[PDB]
Structures are given as structure tokens and as C-alpha cells.
Amino acid sequence: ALSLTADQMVSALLDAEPPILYSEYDPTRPFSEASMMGLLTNLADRELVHMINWAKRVPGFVDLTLHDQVHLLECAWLEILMIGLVWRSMEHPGKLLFAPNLLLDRNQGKCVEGMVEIFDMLLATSSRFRMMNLQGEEFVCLKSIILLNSGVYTFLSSTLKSLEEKDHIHRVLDKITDTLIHLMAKAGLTLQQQHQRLAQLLLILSHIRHMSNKGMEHLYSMVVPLYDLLLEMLDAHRLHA
Amino acid sequence: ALSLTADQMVSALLDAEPPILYSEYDPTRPFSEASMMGLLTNLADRELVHMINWAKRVPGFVDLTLHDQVHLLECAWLEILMIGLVWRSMEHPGKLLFAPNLLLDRNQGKCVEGMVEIFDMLLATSSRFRMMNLQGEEFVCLKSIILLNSGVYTFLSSTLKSLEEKDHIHRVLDKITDTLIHLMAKAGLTLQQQHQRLAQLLLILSHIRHMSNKGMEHLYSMVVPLYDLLLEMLDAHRLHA
Numbered sequence: 130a131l132s133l134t135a136d137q138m139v140s141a142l143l144d145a146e147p148p149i150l151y152s153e154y155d156p157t158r159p160f161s162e163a164s165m166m167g168l169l170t171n172l173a174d175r176e177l178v179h180m181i182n183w184a185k186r187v188p189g190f191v192d193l194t195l196h197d198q199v200h201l202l203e204c205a206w207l208e209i210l211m212i213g214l215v216w217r218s219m220e221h222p223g224k225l226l227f228a229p230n231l232l233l234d235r236n237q238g239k240c241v242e243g244m245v246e247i248f249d250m251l252l253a254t255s256s257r258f259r260m261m262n263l264q265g266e267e268f269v270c271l272k273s274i275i276l277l278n279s280g281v282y283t284f285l286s287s288t289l290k291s292l293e294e295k296d297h298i299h300r301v302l303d304k305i306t307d308t309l310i311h312l313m314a315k316a317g318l319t320l321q322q323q324h325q326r327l328a329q330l331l332l333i334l335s336h337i338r339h340m341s342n343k344g345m346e347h348l349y350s351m352v353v354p355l356y357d358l359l360l361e362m363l364d365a366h367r368l369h370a
Numbered sequence: 371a372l373s374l375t376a377d378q379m380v381s382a383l384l385d386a387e388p389p390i391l392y393s394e395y396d397p398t399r400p401f402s403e404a405s406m407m408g409l410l411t412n413l414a415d416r417e418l419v420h421m422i423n424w425a426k427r428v429p430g431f432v433d434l435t436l437h438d439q440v441h442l443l444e445c446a447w448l449e450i451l452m453i454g455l456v457w458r459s460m461e462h463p464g465k466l467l468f469a470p471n472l473l474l475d476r477n478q479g480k481c482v483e484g485m486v487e488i489f490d491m492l493l494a495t496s497s498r499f500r501m502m503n504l505q506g507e508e509f510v511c512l513k514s515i516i517l518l519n520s521g522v523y524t525f526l527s528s529t530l531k532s533l534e535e536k537d538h539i540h541r542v543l544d545k546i547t548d549t550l551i552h553l554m555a556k557a558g559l560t561l562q563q564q565h566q567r568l569a570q571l572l573l574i575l576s577h578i579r580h581m582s583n584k585g586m587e588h589l590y591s592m593v594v595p596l597y598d599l600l601l602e603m604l605d606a607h608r609l610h611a
């Protein structure tokens with residue numbers, strides 16, 4: 130991601146994409162019996178595992194220390210889930226596609242105490258992406274930027290090592306900027322359209338941070354720390370090579 | 371802000387800048403007696419009044435309906451305060467310059483229940499701006515983008531009027547993007563440096579939304595709605611022309 134071309138970055142990314150998962154519940158039994166938050170919570174958890182594997186495939190992420198990988202993910206996991214949710218609901222107006230067998234509208238979100246507010250923001254985002262006609266090439270770049278950027282300023286202290294982490298990370302963010310502009314340039318936008326489209330895309334990133342923050346406010350609006358779980362997943366051995 | 375040049379936009383903005391205010395407390399009496407949150411709260415409130423007048427001077431803001439002006443400000447007021455705080459603390463390492471007679475460090479932030487966490491994030495932001503060597507021309511563009519962008523996706527419904535609001539607003543955001551790139555171009559960056567610097571600046575915008583959200587979480591971690599106060603200030607007469 131520095132001597133890797135833009136079409137090189139883009140290709141790794143499109144390839145690193147996590148799989149789409151199904152909601153688990155018997156489609157032969159009624160819906161009134163299926164806790165939605167249970168449904169949504171078990172899904173989110175199943176997706177997280179897959180998200181760690183993705184993150185190790187994002188250029189420059191694994192050249193980071195283990196602590197710094199845990200921290201970035203701890204800061205960004207919900208943003209990354211939500212932009213994924215948003216992206217896959219793009220061609221599904223008024224609906225959130227949580228899973229292929231779980232397509233929900235805002236009226237269904239009213240079932241959970243204070244959840245419709247969140248649903249309305251996600252749908253609004255999906256509508257913007259659709260209005261912008263966001264492309265897969267673009268979307269995977271956006272996701273990588275969220276991973277790299279959201280915790281980068283919460284690397285409190287600054288040993289020599291941590292300072293190098295930050296340098297490395299902004300470097301990678303810069304090459305991802307380079308990759309987004311090239312995608313736009315290949316697509317035939319003009320110079321002006323390029324930078325205008327870059328700004329529209331990054332500003333959406335502020336709206337996804339907001340939903341994540343509102344989301345953690347809800348998620349806690351109610352076992353083992355998340356660091357520990359994360360760290361346990363990221364600190365893998367190499368015995369299963 | 372569409373047939374207004376970039377040097378035209380920049381000039382209005384630098385001119386619309388609010389004044390810097392002092393903290394009110396007798397400098398002849400000790401500090402142990404001065405409630406910091408009282409100090410900080412009365413300051414924030416005094417700044418808000420000034421912020422409304424600024425916002426009416428930001429290109430395109432007043433062509434918006436009154437409701438939409440109230441909403442944008444209600445969504446962004448704390449982000450706008452904080453980036454201002456951050457900017458003026460730039461050349462004051464390890465310190466937050468709340469007022470000229472109120473320069474504080476993180477140890478002083480420990481005095482308030484859970485406030486040091488916020489102080490650490492603001493200082494971190496000020497350090498990034500200093501590391502980026504953010505310019506006043508740039509900073510005023512950033513602030514205008516925060517005003518215009520933070521609520522733009524929380525314009526729930528979509529009457530014909532609201533849709534036009536949104537069109538107008540993204541248009542204004544686009545010309546502000548154009549203004550930032552031109553400032554950079556005049557400054558002699560390269561094409562690549564331009565877009566890389568654009569991205570670094572907008573991504574900081576996500577970190578300021580995060581601090582605002584954590585900030586409202588603290589601010590409420592404890593009279594007349596804020597809409598109403600805002601609306602009362604924005605819905606001025608023209609009798610004092």
C-alpha cells in the first residue's frame with residue numbers, strides 16, 4: 130500500500146470482502162416468537178468473527194502491533210458493521226437487509242425500545258449511497274478508511290513505536306485516498322468532480338461515526354471485555370497453516 | 371457560493387469569524403472557589419449567541435428555511451464549539467485555551483467527573499492540527515462544512531421544499547470543497563498533495579463528531595428545549611436595522 134498500485138489495492142480489497150450471512154431462526158415457525166434483538170445480536174456477533182479475518186487482509190493492517198490492531202477494531206467494529214449493512218440495503222428502498230432472509234422496515238424496528246431512531250438513520254444513509262450511486266470499488270475503500278481512521282487518534286501515548294504506527298497508518302490512508310481518486314478518474318469524472326466526489330464520500334463517514342456512537346449508547350442502554358475477545362481472535366497462532 | 375469565487379467565499383468567512391471571549395470570574399479571588407463546569411458552561415453559552423450570528427454569515431445558510439437552520443445548528447453546535455476550542459489551542463501544547471484568561475491542562479480536567487477523557491481527545495485534535503499546520507483559511511472552511519453537513523442527513527421527511535433544501539446544501543458543500551482545493555493549489559501543493567490533504571482534513575471531521583457525541587453523553591450524564599432557544603435567536607425581526 131505504498132509500492133502497491135491503486136488497482137492493486139482495490140483488488141486485494143474486493144477479494145478480502147467478508148461473506149454475507151443468514152439470520153438463524155426456523156422459517157417454519159411464526160415470527161412473533163423470534164426476539165428481533167436476539168436475531169440481530171447473534172448476527173452481529175457472527176459477522177464480527179468474519180470481520181477480523183477481513184481486517185487482516187486490509188493492506189497495512191497487519192504490519193501494526195497486536196495492541197494497535199485490537200484498538201482500531203474496538204473503536205470501529207460497529208461503524209464497519211453498519212456501513213456493511215447500509216451497502217447491502219442500497220437497492221432495497223425503505224428496507225434494511227440484515228440478512229438475505231431478514232429484510233426489515235422501520236415499522237419492524239419500532240418493536241425495540243428506541244431502535245427505530247437508529248433504523249431511520251441507517252435507511253437514510255442507504256438512500257444517500259443509492260443517490261450517489263456508490264460503487265463496490267468505492268465502498269471497500271471507505272470501509273478500510275473507517276478501520277484505519279476511527280481509532281488512530283485514540284492512540285493516547287507516544288512511545289517511539291506508537292509514533293511509527295501513526296506515521297505508517299496515515300501513509301496507508303493517503304494511498305487509499307490515491308486509490309479512490311484513481312477509481313473516479315478511471316470512471317471519467319472531471320478533476321473537479323473527483324475532489325467533489327471525494328468530499329461527499331468522506332463526509333458520509335462522519336454520519337456513520339454518529340450512528341455508531343448512538344448505537345453504542347443504545348447497546349449499553351440496558352461478559353468478557355471486547356478488547357479481550359478481539360485480542361483472542363487477532364492473536365492467532367500459525368499452527369493451522 | 372455558486373457564482374461567488376473561492377477567494378470570495380474565503381473572505382466572507384474570515385470576516386464572519388466570531389470574537390474570542392473571556393471567562394468571567396474575579397482574578398483577585400482564589401481558584402478553589404471557581405466551579406470549573408460553571409466557568410465552562412457560562413462560556414459555552416456566551417459563545418453560542420455569537421455562533422448564531424456567524425452562521426447567518428456563512429454563505430447559503432440563510433437561504434435555508436428557519437426550521438432547517440434551527441435543525442442544523444441543533445445538530446452541530448457542540449462540534450462547532452469544539453473545533454473552535456481546538457483551533458485556538460493549536461499553539462498551546464498540552465493546554466486547552468478556553469479563554470485568554472482560561473488556559474487549562476488535562477490535570478485540571480480531572481476535577482470534573484469523567485471530563486479528562488474529553489480533554490484528552492480535544493488536546494489530541496489540537497496536536498493533529500498543529501502537526502498538519504492547519505491554516506485559518508482552511509479552518510473556517512472546515513467549520514462551515516460542519517454546520518452544513520452534520521444535520522443534513524437528519525432532515526427526516528421530504529416534502530418538495532425539503533428536497534430543495536438538501537440540493538441547495540450539497541451544492542454549497544461542493545463549492546466549499548472547491549474553495550479548500552483552491553487554497554491548497556494556491557499554496558503550491560501538488561495535485562496529489564491536494565487531494566491527500568483534503569482527505570486528511572475531512573477525516574478529522576469524523577473525530578470531532580465523535581467528541582461531540584461523547585460530549586453530549588457527558589453533558590447529559592447528570593430548562594427550555596434547545597430548539598426553542600435556537601429558534602428564538604434565529605427568528606429575529608428586522609426592526610433593528
Ligand SMILES: C[C@@H]1c2c(ccc(O)c2F)O[C@@H](c2ccc(OCCN3CCCCC3)cc2)[C@H]1c1ccc(O)cc1
Nearest residue numbers: 169170172173174177210211214244247343344347348
Ligand atoms: C444496525 C445493527 C446491526 C445488527 C446486525 C447486523 C448488522 O450488520 C448490524 F449493523 O443488529 C443490531 C446490533 C448490532 C450490534 C450488536 O452488538 C451486540 C454485542 N456484540 C457485538 C460484537 C462483539 C460481541 C458483542 C447488537 C445488535 C443493529 C443495531 C445496532 C445498534 C443499535 O443501537 C440498535 C441496533
Ligand SMILES: C[C@@H]1c2c(ccc(O)c2F)O[C@@H](c2ccc(OCCN3CCCCC3)cc2)[C@H]1c1ccc(O)cc1
Nearest residue numbers: 410411413414415418451452455485488584585588589
Ligand atoms: C469542550 C467544551 C467547551 C466549553 C467551553 C467553551 C468551549 O468552546 C468548549 F468547546 O466548556 C465545556 C462545555 C461545553 C458546552 C456546554 O453546554 C452547556 C449547555 N448550554 C450549551 C448551549 C445552549 C445552552 C445549553 C457546557 C460545558 C466543554 C465540555 C463539553 C462537553 C463535555 O462533556 C465536557 C466539557
